[PDB]
UniProtKB/Swiss-Prot annotation, chain A:
It comes from Geobacillus kaustophilus (strain HTA426). It is found in: Cell membrane. Belongs to the ATPase gamma chain family. This is ATP synthase gamma chain. F-type ATPases have 2 components, CF(1) - the catalytic core - and CF(0) - the membrane proton channel. CF(1) has five subunits: alpha(3), beta(3), gamma(1), delta(1), epsilon(1). CF(0) has three main subunits: a, b and c. Produces ATP from ADP in the presence of a proton gradient across the membrane. The gamma chain is believed to be important in regulating ATPase activity and the flow of protons through the CF(0) complex.
From Swiss-Prot, chain B:
The gene is atpA. Produces ATP from ADP in the presence of a proton gradient across the membrane. The alpha chain is a regulatory subunit. This is ATP synthase subunit alpha. Its main location: membrane. It comes from Geobacillus kaustophilus (strain HTA426). GO terms for cellular component: plasma membrane; proton-transporting ATP synthase complex. The record marks 109 as: Required for activity. It is found in: Cell membrane. One of its GO terms (molecular function) is ATP binding. The chain holds residues 252 to 377 of 502 of the full protein. Belongs to the ATPase alpha/beta chains family. Transmembrane segments: none annotated. Keywords: ATP synthesis, ATP-binding, Cell membrane, CF(1), Hydrogen ion transport, Ion transport, Membrane, Nucleotide-binding, Translocase, Transport.
Length: 57, 124
């Protein structure tokens, strides 16, 4: 049962889908290792707040 | 004679399915077992529908041929044949009458003549 040229349409559709998918994975993997950059860059400010917020008796 | 006629060929597919038999019984050398002339079969038929010039009484016979598609495969032998013939076609998905009812696939469905048919009321 079914087609052939209707089985090609599906393959290629799937393929171009995987492409677009894996694209964004790598793309969103490129946005993890920039989360640190703005994660780090905030490390100091936090330290020098609890150090201030040491809390009077 | 000068009157307008309308002929509905309901299921030309079965005709071809028949004619194949007929031809295969007569042992006529057989694509898809259908005779080489299986095209000519429907060609010399639907051709006999037209609009006779007003020199002939402006008479006409409209043809509404049918074709039974398996799986909806429009690329099938018979269907390409009947299509390469008719002026336009209206393809009915069931893919739909299980939303838009009288399943009329606005996408594939064409009319060659079209627009020259509709009156100035429709046209605009």
């Amino acid at each position: 049962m079914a087609s052939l040229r209707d089985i090609k349409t599906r393959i290629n559709a799937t393929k171009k889908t995987s492409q677009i998918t894996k694209a964004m994975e790598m793309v969103s993997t490129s946005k993890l290792n920039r989360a640190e950059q703005n994660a780090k860059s905030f490390v100091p400010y936090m330290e020098k707040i609890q150090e201030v917020v040491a809390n009077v008796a | 004679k000068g009157k307008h006629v309308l002929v509905v060929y309901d299921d030309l597919s079965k005709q071809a399915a028949a004619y194949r038999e007929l031809s295969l019984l007569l042992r006529r050398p057989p694509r898809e077992a259908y005779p080489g002339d299986i095209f000519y079969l429907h060609s010399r038929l639907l051709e006999r529908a037209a609009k006779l010039s007003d020199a002939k009484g402006g008479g006409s016979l409209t043809a509404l041929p049918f074709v039974e598609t398996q799986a909806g495969d429009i690329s099938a032998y018979i269907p390409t044949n009947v299509i390469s013939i008719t002026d336009g076609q209206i393809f009915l998905q069931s893919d739909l009458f299980f939303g838009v009812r009288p399943a009329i696939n606005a996408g594939l469905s064409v009319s060659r003549v079209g627009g020259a048919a509709q009156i100035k009321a429709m046209k605009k």
